Structures are given as structure tokens and as C-alpha cells.
Design a protein around this ligand. Structure first.
Ligand SMILES: Nc1ncnc2c1ncn2[C@@H]1O[C@H](COP(=O)(O)OP(=O)(O)OP(=O)(O)O)[C@@H](O)[C@H]1O
Ligand SMILES: [Zn+2]
Lengths: 121, 320, 74, 53
RNA sequence: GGGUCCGCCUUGAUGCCCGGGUGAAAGCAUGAUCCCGGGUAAUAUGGCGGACCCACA
């Protein structure tokens, strides 16, 4: 799998990330698409970044992992951009999503942010 | 399959005892990075969106260059091989304008046609084809290779003479098939001697390799980003000249017969030729005043009218 | 009259298409064997030796001429 | 865009898998470049990691 | 007087591209839409000057 994927993500944790997008979409606020996600990180609004693993060209989302690490924002990988798009509530694919306000998935984002920090190291 | 750039030419020997002096000249291999850039050509993979001229302007601005030029205009929506000659090499693109091109194209049919009929009709468009009806202007299609058919979509590779409009070719195929067709996607895979190989580079990798040179001191990546100007000349008939004739040509003299050491066969009067040193350096582009047989047999006369000089005057000493 | 050839089909973009063995000129008048006016040559394309000709029809129902042989009125 | 290419054998296709060797294909066109290149520094950190710089 | 190299001298019916903001029925989050900022329009020919040469190797 592509070189922008820094760490191996378990099947269960990827589902929890997609669940976190689904819930926060209608209960809180999310940014969907690479430009919106990147701005959210740049502005320090994103609490969690979700990046697809099937992005081609890779350069589209390649800047995100080192941007997230600079701005101290946790990130997670999901297998499919099509699946990530549907979770964001759009009919097309999404290369990356950002969560601004988790809403009801607040505890779910906490669980992800703690578990990705262990995968990072 | 094969473009006129692929068929090898015989090298005719005029002077068997012709020798080159290592004291003079800079062959591509021993050019310092700065000189390499000065006489360089980027084999660029153009992104769809910007014009070819915009992309060249981006390159000049980012690499801090005074001059640059591209070898055969790619339309804005079209991606692929775009030779970008730099600085002192800028004008070598003139050898690339009339060169044969290769494309991968996607044709979308406006009706349902059986696979056998698609292939048969497209096979008919190989050879000399009419690009403008009279009241006769023709263009050569060297090959059409149908890669796959997915319903109304036909993906194919096509090798063409310079000035062949692929959009037009597809429109005409659609008329010959009855149902109509349009070009939904185009990518250039070859522009003369430049093709999709290890040397093809994106703007992203180009600028990043430049940064690896300026900040990290690593020149190897940016060196590989740029080809010598001699590459832009690989498809042309060549005349190899003696050391004693090199400085004359770079000072404005036309090439006379007693200066020729080696030459390609098949050169006709009026042909664009590349004048080379015996170290395979590009000296000049010229118009042949003689045939290959004339150059080989004769002892006197102007063989090549020199049109564009690329080699600096001080590389070889004045020996005339 | 100089024979063009069989009408292969009526293209939906609005042209009768004929395969022939010579190169007609733009705006040449096109008739059938009985000299009845059919249309006008608007494009010549394909192989130089065996080109396709796009004929802009000037009759009400051009579809009836599919499979019929057309000529350039001279 | 839907023209794809096999990275290893160089086959042009519309399919997700290569019809020749049987591996995942990549889109044929290069990504959009910006002369402003706002995130080029972050791309380089990734690229230096990959190339071992 | 000429050639080569370089410098200088001319025009353009809102587009398109890139970016900042916004972020939505075949299109489309790998960016719709609109607002704003920038970039690029024919990579000639003719003319004037500067430098180097006038070359059969
Ligand atoms: N008969 C036609 N006349 C004009 N344009 C056409 C015609 N058929 C297809 N096209 C063009 O081809 C494009 C391809 O889109 P679309 O897939 O809807 O076409 P299609 O013929 O239905 O293809 P498919 O049947 O494979 O889905 C369309 O946007 C349309 O502009
Ligand atoms: Zn393959």
C-alpha cells in the first residue's frame, strides 16, 4: 500500500473512524475533501483527520500526515475513499475528512486519538 | 509500433582517420550541473489544465531561468510528454516541432457498434489520410493500436505525423462508423525522441529535486531531471565534423565538405540536419545543401547551411 | 456524372456517408443514377486512395438513400 | 479522467487491474501543480522520508 | 557588405489556468457555484544596435 500511509491500521479501528465521521456529520460539524480538511488543520479546527488509503495520485493527500504532526493533530487511515465519502454524507468519494466538532462521537474520537498515538510510536 | 524516428540510419565514413582531441569540448557526460542546465531539456509530464506556455513560465520562475521553450504544443486538457528546453538549449525545440508524435486517446462512440467493425474501420485510418478536402492536404498515421473496448469507449494508441489533430481523427472515425464519436481524453506518450521512460518527470518531482540540490547539496536527482540538448536531436540525420571545423561553424561559417568526418545516409537537399562533434556534442542545426552521397564523394562546396548554433565559441580553438 | 459509391449509412450528426475511390471537392452536388438531387459534399476524410465522403442531405427523408449509389453531378 | 496505466509493465487500460500481469493500475495523468505550491514543504518531508534523505 | 551569438523595438471581444474565501439529475469533495487576487495569450516576420568572425577545416 502507498507510501503516505505511515502506519498499519487494524480493521476494527478503521470502522470506528468511519463511524466517527458518520455520527459527527449530523450531530456536530465535519470538513470533507482534501482542501477543506487541510484548511481545518491549518486553522487548528480539526480534532481528527481521516485519510483514505486508495488515493491516486498520492500527492493529493501526501502533505497531510506531516502537516498533522506539525500542528499536533491526530490522523487515521481508512481503506476506501468511496466508503469515506458516503460516511461524510456525499454521493462521491472523499480522499480526506476532518472532524471539527465530534458531537455524540466525542468519546469515539477520544478512543481513536489515544489508539493512533500508540501506532505512531 | 514504429515512427520514422525509430528506423536506424547507416553511418557513412568519409574520414577513417578522423580523431577527436580530448583537450577540447564538453560532452554531455562531463558537464558540470550548471553547464548541464544551460544546455538542458526537461522531459516533462505536463498536467492537464494549464497551457504548454504557462507550464514553461512556471518552470522559468521556479528554477530562476532567463529562457525556456517547449517542443510541440500540448493542448490545455492534454497531459503527457512535453520537452522543455532550457536557457542556451531553448531553440532546440525547432527540431521537435516537425517530429512524429504518439498518443493514447479515449474515443467515446455515440452509438453501439460491434467490436469487429470498430477495429476494421480504425485500421483503414492508417497510412496517408485527408485532413483538408480540396476547394490536397494530407497527414500520415503510422499506426493505430486498439488497446481495449469498454462499451462505447475505445482506448487506442496512435502514432502520427506532426500536425495531425487527434480530436479531428476521432470525429472522422465516428462519421465512418455512422454513430458519431468524440475525444473524451488525450495523453501524449511520445514527442520525437522523447518518450514515457525513466526520464519523464512531473513538475512536483522537478521542483522537489531542485530543492534537494539547493538546500541539501544533493545534485544527483536534479541532474537526472534534465536531459542534455543532444537528446532533442536523436531523431535527426547527423553530420559528424572534425575538430578543425567546429570553431568555424560556431563563429558563423557554413559547413564545407572537407570538414565532414562521418554522416548519416538518406540526407536530401533541404533536410534539417544536426551538426555534431566526434564527441557527439551538438554544434548546430542546419539545412543540407547536399545529399549524403554528395557530401561523401565531393571534396569541395558548402554541405550544410548553418541555421542555429548551440555550442559556445570557446569550446574549440580557432583552427581555420 | 462521376460515381461516388454506396451510401453506407446516414450519420446521426446529419450526413450521408459514402466510400469512394477518388477525392471530391467541397460543395460538389450529389445526385442518384436518375439525376435527382440528393445533397452536397461537406467533408472528405480517411485514406487518400479510398476516402469517406460526408454528404449534407437536401431531401426530406435522407434515410431512404442508405444502400443506394450516389454520383457527383458534372 | 479514466485512462489508467500499469506502473510495472506500462500497459494503458481503463480497468482497475492490469489485463496483462494482473496488478492495480494508476491514473495516467500527473496531479495538478501550483506555482504557489502552498504545501510543498510538507510534501518534501514525505519525499525525503521515502528517498532516504 | 555578410554570417553567427546576444540585446532592443509591436498588437490582442469578459476566456482558460493557478491560488485566497465559500463548500454543492450525465458533471462533481482528486472541488459545483459565486466573490476576490494573480498568471498566461501568436513558443513569427520586419527593423535598430552591440560583440565575435569572414572561416573549404
Ligand atoms: N447521440 C449522441 N449525440 C451527442 N452526444 C452524445 C451522444 N451519445 C453520447 N454523447 C456524448 O457522450 C458523453 C458520454 O456520456 P454518457 O456515458 O452519458 O454517453 P452514453 O452514450 O450514454 O455512454 P454509455 O452508453 O456508455 O453510458 C455524453 O456527455 C454526451 O455528450
Ligand atoms: Zn501490467
Amino acid at each position: 500500500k502507498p507510501s503516505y500511509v505511515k502506519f498499519e491500521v487494524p480493521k476494527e479501528l478503521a470502522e470506528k473512524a468511519l463511524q466517527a465521521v458518520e455520527i459527527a456529520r449530523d450531530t456536530g460539524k465535519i470538513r470533507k475533501g482534501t482542501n477543506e480538511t487541510t484548511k481545518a488543520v491549518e486553522r487548528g479546527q480539526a480534532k481528527l483527520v481521516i485519510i483514505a488509503e486508495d488515493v491516486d495520485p498520492e500527492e493529493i493527500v501526501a502533505h497531510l500526515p506531516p502537516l498533522c504532526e506539525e500542528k499536533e493533530i491526530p490522523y487515521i487511515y481508512v481503506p476506501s475513499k468511496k466508503e469515506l465519502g458516503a460516511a461524510a454524507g456525499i454521493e462521491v468519494a472523499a480522499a480526506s475528512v476532518a472532524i471539527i466538532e465530534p458531537g455524540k462521537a466525542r468519546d469515539l474520537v477520544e478512543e481513536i486519538a489515544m489508539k493512533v498515538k500508540e501506532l505512531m510510536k | 509500433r514504429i515512427l520514422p524516428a525509430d528506423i536506424k540510419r547507416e553511418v557513412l565514413i568519409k574520414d577513417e582517420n578522423a580523431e577527436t582531441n580530448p583537450d577540447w569540448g564538453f560532452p554531455p557526460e562531463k558537464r558540470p550541473i550548471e553547464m548541464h542546465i544551460q544546455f538542458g531539456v526537461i522531459n516533462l509530464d505536463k498536467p492537464p489544465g494549464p497551457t504548454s506556455h504557462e507550464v514553461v513560465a512556471w518552470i522559468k520562475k521556479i528554477l530562476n531561468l532567463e529562457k525556456a521553450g517547449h517542443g510541440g504544443t500540448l493542448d490545455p486538457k492534454v497531459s503527457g510528454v512535453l520537452p522543455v528546453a532550457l536557457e542556451k538549449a531553448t531553440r532546440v525545440v525547432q527540431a521537435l516541432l516537425p517530429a512524429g508524435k504518439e498518443y493514447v486517446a479515449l474515443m467515446h462512440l455515440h452509438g453501439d457498434v460491434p467490436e469487429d467493425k470498430i477495429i476494421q474501420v480504425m485500421k483503414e485510418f492508417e497510412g496517408e489520410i485527408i485532413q483538408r478536402p480540396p476547394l490536397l492536404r494530407t497527414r500520415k498515421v503510422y499506426y493505430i493500436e486498439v488497446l481495449e473496448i469498454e462499451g462505447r469507449d475505445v482506448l487506442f494508441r496512435v502514432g502520427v505525423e506532426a500536425g495531425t489533430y487527434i480530436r479531428s481523427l476521432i470525429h472522422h472515425i465516428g462519421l465512418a462508423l455512422g454513430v458519431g464519436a468524440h475525444m473524451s481524453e488525450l495523453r501524449r506518450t511520445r514527442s520525437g525522441p522523447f518518450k514515457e521512460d525513466e526520464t519523464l518527470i512531473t513538475l512536483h518531482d522537478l521542483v522537489d529535486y531542485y530543492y534537494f540540490w539547493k538546500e541539501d547539496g544533493i545534485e544527483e536527482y536534479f541532474r537526472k531531471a534534465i536531459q542534455p540538448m543532444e537528446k532533442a536531436v536523436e531523431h535527426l540525420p547527423k553530420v559528424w565534423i572534425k575538430d578543425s571545423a567546429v570553431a568555424a561553424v560556431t563563429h558563423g561559417a557554413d559547413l564545407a565538405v572537407p570538414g565532414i568526418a562521418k554522416l548519416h545516409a538518406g540526407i536530401k537537399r533541404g533536410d534539417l540536419v544536426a551538426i555534431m562533434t566526434l564527441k557527439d556534442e551538438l554544434v548546430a542545426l542546419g539545412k543540407a545543401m547536399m545529399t549524403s552521397q554528395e557530401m561523401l564523394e565531393k571534396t569541395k562546396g558548402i554541405a550544410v547551411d548553418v541555421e542555429k548554433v548551440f555550442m559556445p565559441r570557446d569550446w574549440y580553438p580557432k583552427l581555420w | 456524372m462521376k460515381r461516388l459509391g454506396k451510401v453506407l449509412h446516414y450519420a446521426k450528426q446529419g450526413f450521408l456517408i459514402v466510400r469512394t475511390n477518388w477525392v471530391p471537392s467541397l460543395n460538389d452536388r450529389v445526385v442518384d443514377k436518375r439525376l435527382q438531387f440528393v445533397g452536397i459534399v461537406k467533408d472528405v476524410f480517411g485514406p487518400v486512395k479510398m476516402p469517406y465522403v460526408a454528404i449534407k442531405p437536401k431531401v426530406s427523408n435522407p434515410e431512404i438513400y442508405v444502400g443506394e449509389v450516389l454520383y457527383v453531378d458534372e | 479522467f479514466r485512462i489508467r496505466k500499469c506502473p510495472k509493465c506500462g500497459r494503458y487500460t481503463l480497468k482497475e487491474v492490469c489485463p496483462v500481469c494482473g496488478e492495480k493500475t494508476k491514473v495516467a495523468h500527473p496531479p495538478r501543480f501550483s506555482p504557489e505550491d502552498p504545501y510543498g514543504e510538507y510534501r518534501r518531508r514525505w519525499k525525503r522520508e521515502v528517498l532516504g534523505i
